[PDB]
Amino acid sequence: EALQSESHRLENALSIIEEERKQLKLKEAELQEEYQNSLRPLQQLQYLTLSACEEEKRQELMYEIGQIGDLIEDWATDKREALKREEGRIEDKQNELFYKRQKLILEVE
Amino acid sequence: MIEERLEALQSESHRLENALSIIEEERKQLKLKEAELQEEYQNSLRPLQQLQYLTLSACEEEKRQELMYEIGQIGDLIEDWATDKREALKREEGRIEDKQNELFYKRQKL
Protein backbone atom coordinates (compact mmCIF):
# COMPACT_ATOMS: atom_id res chain seq x y z
CA GLU A 1 0.00 0.00 0.00
CA ALA A 2 2.57 2.54 -1.21
CA LEU A 3 0.75 4.56 -3.88
CA GLN A 4 -1.90 5.36 -1.27
CA SER A 5 0.68 7.55 0.46
CA GLU A 6 3.48 7.95 -2.09
CA SER A 7 1.24 8.94 -5.01
CA HIS A 8 -0.95 11.20 -2.86
CA ARG A 9 2.03 12.64 -0.93
CA LEU A 10 3.96 13.33 -4.14
CA GLU A 11 1.07 15.08 -5.90
CA ASN A 12 0.94 17.46 -2.91
CA ALA A 13 4.64 18.16 -2.44
CA LEU A 14 4.63 18.72 -6.21
CA SER A 15 1.84 21.31 -6.12
CA ILE A 16 3.59 22.88 -3.12
CA ILE A 17 6.58 23.34 -5.43
CA GLU A 18 4.36 24.90 -8.08
CA GLU A 19 3.03 27.43 -5.61
CA GLU A 20 6.50 28.38 -4.40
CA ARG A 21 7.40 28.80 -8.07
CA LYS A 22 4.54 31.27 -8.52
CA GLN A 23 5.39 32.96 -5.21
CA LEU A 24 8.93 33.40 -6.51
CA LYS A 25 7.82 34.87 -9.85
CA LEU A 26 5.95 37.43 -7.74
CA LYS A 27 8.93 38.34 -5.58
CA GLU A 28 10.76 38.95 -8.86
CA ALA A 29 8.18 41.57 -9.87
CA GLU A 30 8.35 43.10 -6.40
CA LEU A 31 12.11 43.56 -6.63
CA GLN A 32 11.78 45.30 -9.99
CA GLU A 33 9.10 47.66 -8.69
CA GLU A 34 11.24 48.22 -5.59
CA TYR A 35 14.25 48.78 -7.84
CA GLN A 36 12.29 51.36 -9.84
CA ASN A 37 10.99 53.18 -6.75
CA SER A 38 14.41 53.23 -5.12
CA LEU A 39 15.75 55.08 -8.18
CA ARG A 40 13.03 57.71 -8.52
CA PRO A 41 14.55 60.42 -6.25
CA LEU A 42 17.99 59.83 -7.80
CA GLN A 43 16.55 60.42 -11.25
CA GLN A 44 14.64 63.40 -9.86
CA LEU A 45 17.96 64.85 -8.76
CA GLN A 46 19.32 64.35 -12.26
CA TYR A 47 16.54 66.39 -13.86
CA LEU A 48 16.35 69.07 -11.18
CA THR A 49 20.10 69.65 -11.26
CA LEU A 50 19.93 70.46 -14.95
CA SER A 51 17.71 73.49 -14.34
CA ALA A 52 18.99 74.83 -11.05
CA CYS A 53 22.74 74.34 -10.81
CA GLU A 54 25.89 75.81 -12.29
CA GLU A 55 26.82 73.94 -15.43
CA GLU A 56 30.52 73.99 -14.51
CA LYS A 57 29.73 72.37 -11.16
CA ARG A 58 27.05 69.99 -12.37
CA GLN A 59 29.46 67.24 -13.42
CA GLU A 60 30.80 66.92 -9.88
CA LEU A 61 27.13 66.58 -8.94
CA MET A 62 26.49 63.86 -11.51
CA TYR A 63 29.52 61.96 -10.21
CA GLU A 64 28.00 61.84 -6.73
CA ILE A 65 24.68 60.83 -8.29
CA GLY A 66 26.48 57.99 -10.04
CA GLN A 67 28.11 56.96 -6.78
CA ILE A 68 24.62 56.61 -5.31
CA GLY A 69 23.62 54.75 -8.45
CA ASP A 70 26.21 52.07 -7.68
CA LEU A 71 25.14 51.53 -4.07
CA ILE A 72 21.56 51.00 -5.22
CA GLU A 73 22.84 48.88 -8.09
CA ASP A 74 24.72 46.64 -5.66
CA TRP A 75 21.72 46.37 -3.33
CA ALA A 76 19.27 45.30 -6.04
CA THR A 77 21.58 42.87 -7.81
CA ASP A 78 22.43 41.29 -4.46
CA LYS A 79 18.73 40.76 -3.90
CA ARG A 80 18.39 39.51 -7.48
CA GLU A 81 21.05 36.93 -6.65
CA ALA A 82 19.20 35.79 -3.53
CA LEU A 83 16.08 35.13 -5.63
CA LYS A 84 18.19 33.28 -8.18
CA ARG A 85 19.47 30.99 -5.43
CA GLU A 86 15.87 30.37 -4.40
CA GLU A 87 15.03 29.60 -8.02
CA GLY A 88 17.62 26.83 -8.00
CA ARG A 89 16.49 25.36 -4.68
CA ILE A 90 12.90 25.08 -5.94
CA GLU A 91 14.00 23.60 -9.25
CA ASP A 92 16.19 21.11 -7.42
CA LYS A 93 13.27 20.08 -5.23
CA GLN A 94 11.10 19.71 -8.35
CA ASN A 95 13.44 17.28 -10.13
CA GLU A 96 13.91 15.26 -6.94
CA LEU A 97 10.15 14.77 -6.71
CA PHE A 98 10.02 14.04 -10.45
CA TYR A 99 12.59 11.29 -9.90
CA LYS A 100 10.60 10.12 -6.89
CA ARG A 101 7.45 9.74 -9.01
CA GLN A 102 9.18 7.75 -11.77
CA LYS A 103 10.53 5.24 -9.24
CA LEU A 104 7.20 5.08 -7.38
CA ILE A 105 5.63 3.78 -10.60
CA LEU A 106 8.17 0.96 -10.38
CA GLU A 107 7.14 0.30 -6.79
CA VAL A 108 3.45 0.04 -7.68
CA GLU A 109 4.41 -2.59 -10.32
CA MET B 1 32.43 1.14 36.59
CA ILE B 2 35.22 3.70 36.66
CA GLU B 3 36.06 3.24 32.99
CA GLU B 4 32.70 4.47 31.75
CA ARG B 5 33.04 7.16 34.42
CA LEU B 6 36.30 8.31 32.83
CA GLU B 7 34.99 8.11 29.26
CA ALA B 8 32.02 10.36 30.02
CA LEU B 9 34.29 12.95 31.67
CA GLN B 10 36.42 13.15 28.53
CA SER B 11 33.57 13.62 26.05
CA GLU B 12 32.18 16.32 28.34
CA SER B 13 35.54 18.11 28.36
CA HIS B 14 35.68 17.81 24.58
CA ARG B 15 32.07 18.98 24.31
CA LEU B 16 32.48 21.96 26.64
CA GLU B 17 35.84 23.01 25.23
CA ASN B 18 34.56 22.80 21.65
CA ALA B 19 31.36 24.80 22.14
CA LEU B 20 33.40 27.45 23.96
CA SER B 21 35.85 27.81 21.09
CA ILE B 22 32.94 28.10 18.65
CA ILE B 23 31.30 30.91 20.59
CA GLU B 24 34.52 32.88 21.10
CA GLU B 25 35.12 32.94 17.35
CA GLU B 26 31.50 33.78 16.57
CA ARG B 27 31.66 36.69 19.02
CA LYS B 28 34.80 37.87 17.24
CA GLN B 29 32.98 37.41 13.93
CA LEU B 30 29.97 39.39 15.13
CA LYS B 31 32.05 42.30 16.40
CA LEU B 32 33.78 42.51 13.02
CA LYS B 33 30.57 42.68 11.02
CA GLU B 34 29.37 45.30 13.48
CA ALA B 35 32.24 47.65 12.68
CA GLU B 36 31.82 46.62 9.05
CA LEU B 37 28.29 47.98 9.24
CA GLN B 38 29.22 51.25 10.92
CA GLU B 39 31.83 51.68 8.18
CA GLU B 40 29.46 50.76 5.36
CA TYR B 41 26.84 53.09 6.83
CA GLN B 42 29.13 56.12 6.75
CA ASN B 43 30.57 55.33 3.32
CA SER B 44 27.02 54.95 1.97
CA LEU B 45 26.26 58.51 3.07
CA ARG B 46 29.46 60.22 1.91
CA PRO B 47 28.06 61.01 -1.59
CA LEU B 48 24.78 62.20 -0.06
CA GLN B 49 26.59 64.65 2.18
CA GLN B 50 28.77 65.68 -0.74
CA LEU B 51 25.63 66.76 -2.58
CA GLN B 52 24.32 68.69 0.42
CA TYR B 53 27.58 70.63 0.47
CA LEU B 54 27.84 71.05 -3.29
CA THR B 55 24.24 72.14 -3.84
CA LEU B 56 24.62 74.99 -1.36
CA SER B 57 27.26 76.69 -3.50
CA ALA B 58 26.11 75.79 -7.00
CA CYS B 59 22.31 75.74 -7.10
CA GLU B 60 19.60 78.38 -7.08
CA GLU B 61 18.33 79.06 -3.57
CA GLU B 62 14.66 78.77 -4.54
CA LYS B 63 15.22 75.24 -5.91
CA ARG B 64 17.64 73.68 -3.42
CA GLN B 65 14.83 72.83 -0.99
CA GLU B 66 13.43 70.55 -3.67
CA LEU B 67 16.84 68.88 -4.00
CA MET B 68 17.27 68.44 -0.24
CA TYR B 69 13.88 66.71 -0.19
CA GLU B 70 15.07 64.17 -2.73
CA ILE B 71 18.32 63.77 -0.78
CA GLY B 72 16.27 62.96 2.29
CA GLN B 73 14.27 60.39 0.35
CA ILE B 74 17.55 58.65 -0.41
CA GLY B 75 18.81 58.89 3.15
CA ASP B 76 15.64 57.08 4.19
CA LEU B 77 16.54 54.22 1.89
CA ILE B 78 20.06 53.89 3.28
CA GLU B 79 18.53 54.20 6.74
CA ASP B 80 16.25 51.23 6.17
CA TRP B 81 19.02 49.18 4.58
CA ALA B 82 21.31 49.77 7.57
CA THR B 83 18.79 49.36 10.39
CA ASP B 84 17.59 46.08 8.90
CA LYS B 85 21.22 45.05 8.70
CA ARG B 86 21.55 46.27 12.29
CA GLU B 87 18.66 44.07 13.34
CA ALA B 88 20.21 41.06 11.63
CA LEU B 89 23.35 41.56 13.72
CA LYS B 90 21.27 41.94 16.86
CA ARG B 91 19.68 38.57 16.07
CA GLU B 92 23.09 36.91 15.86
CA GLU B 93 24.05 38.43 19.21
CA GLY B 94 21.10 36.79 20.95
CA ARG B 95 21.78 33.46 19.26
CA ILE B 96 25.25 33.36 20.78
CA GLU B 97 24.00 34.56 24.16
CA ASP B 98 21.44 31.76 23.91
CA LYS B 99 24.11 29.12 23.33
CA GLN B 100 26.01 30.60 26.27
CA ASN B 101 23.04 30.39 28.61
CA GLU B 102 22.27 26.81 27.57
CA LEU B 103 25.81 25.91 28.58
CA PHE B 104 25.71 27.78 31.90
CA TYR B 105 22.43 26.75 33.48
CA LYS B 106 22.80 23.00 32.90
CA ARG B 107 26.11 23.22 34.82
CA GLN B 108 25.57 25.86 37.54
CA LYS B 109 28.01 24.00 39.82
CA LEU B 110 30.23 27.10 40.34
Numbering used by the authors:
A (entry chain B): 7 to 115
B (entry chain A): 1 to 110
Can you quote the paper on this entry?
Despite this discouraging trend, LapD2 was the sole exception and after systematic optimization of its crystallization conditions it formed crystals that diffracted to 2.2 Å. The crystallographic phase problem was overcome using selenomethionine-incorporated protein and the single wavelength anomalous dispersion (SAD) technique. The overall structure of LapD2 shows that it adopts a helix-turn-helix fold that is reminiscent of the WXG100 family of small secreted T7SS effectors. However, in contrast to characterized WXG100 proteins, which typically form head-to-toe homodimers mediated by hydrophobic interactions, the turn region of LapD2 contains an intermolecular disulfide bond formed by cysteine 59 that facilitates head-to-head dimerization. The head region of LapD2 also possesses a hydrophobic patch that may contribute to dimerization. Not surprisingly, the energy of head-to-head dimer formation as predicted by the PDBePISA webtool is highly favorable (ΔiG = −21.0) due to the combined effects of burying a hydrophobic patch from the aqueous milieu and possessing a disulfide linkage. PDBePISA also revealed a toe-to-toe homodimer interface, and this interaction was also suggested to be favorable, although with a lower energy of formation (ΔiG = −11.6). Notably, conservation is very low within the interhelical turn region, which contrasts with the highly conserved WXG motif found within structurally similar WXG100 proteins. One of the more striking features of LapD2 is the disulfide bond formed by Cys59 that contributes to dimerization. This residue is not conserved among Lap2 proteins indicating that an intermolecular disulfide bond is likely not a universal property of this protein family. Consistent with not playing an important role in LapD2 function, we found that an S. intermedius GC1825 ΔlapD2 strain expressing plasmid-borne LapD2C59S secretes wild-type levels of TelD.
